């Protein structure tokens, strides 16, 4: 599913990411834009041979099992294909684990390079939330 901006803001809020570990909702929506362009089906292979899945591009090296990433963990205990559904519940609970991880949203290279330091409120401006 390709989400609209506010539609995802609203799903992200209902699943409890708004200020989760102190990250306002616009951080999460910005991260999603520059990771998947809001597309639950987005997949991208990494140079290390892992793959990133879903609206938040969660990788198979650490967080999920895709049956082809050697020597990988699945710390969120799920198939990576769960991360591609239109129900974003798996991506969101997994994202909670990742972000509690020690490095915050720096774990998302797009957030760090494109969202951090920026006016992330603009990503939800105009949404009914």
Curated annotation (Swiss-Prot):
Record keyword Signal present: yes
GO molecular function: beta-N-acetylglucosaminidase activity; identical protein binding; lysozyme activity
E.C. number: 3.2.1.17
Domain of life (superkingdom): Eukaryota
GO BP: cell wall macromolecule catabolic process; defense response to bacterium; defense response to Gram-negative bacterium; defense response to Gram-positive bacterium; killing of cells of another organism
Tissue specificity of this protein: In the egg white and polymorphonuclear leukocytes.
SMART domains for the chain: LYZ1
Active site: 35, 52
Subcellular location: Secreted
UniProt KW keywords: Allergen, Antimicrobial, Bacteriolytic enzyme, Disulfide bond, Glycosidase, Hydrolase, Secreted, Signal
CDD domains, A to Z: LYZ_C (cd16897)
Stated family: Belongs to the glycosyl hydrolase 22 family.
UniProt function note: Lysozymes have primarily a bacteriolytic function; those in tissues and body fluids are associated with the monocyte-macrophage system and enhance the activity of immunoagents. Has bacteriolytic activity against M.luteus.
Anything else known: Lysozyme C is capable of both hydrolysis and transglycosylation; it also shows a slight esterase activity. It acts rapidly on both peptide-substituted and unsubstituted peptidoglycan, and slowly on chitin oligosaccharides.
Name this polypeptide is given: Lysozyme C
Chain's gene name: LYZ
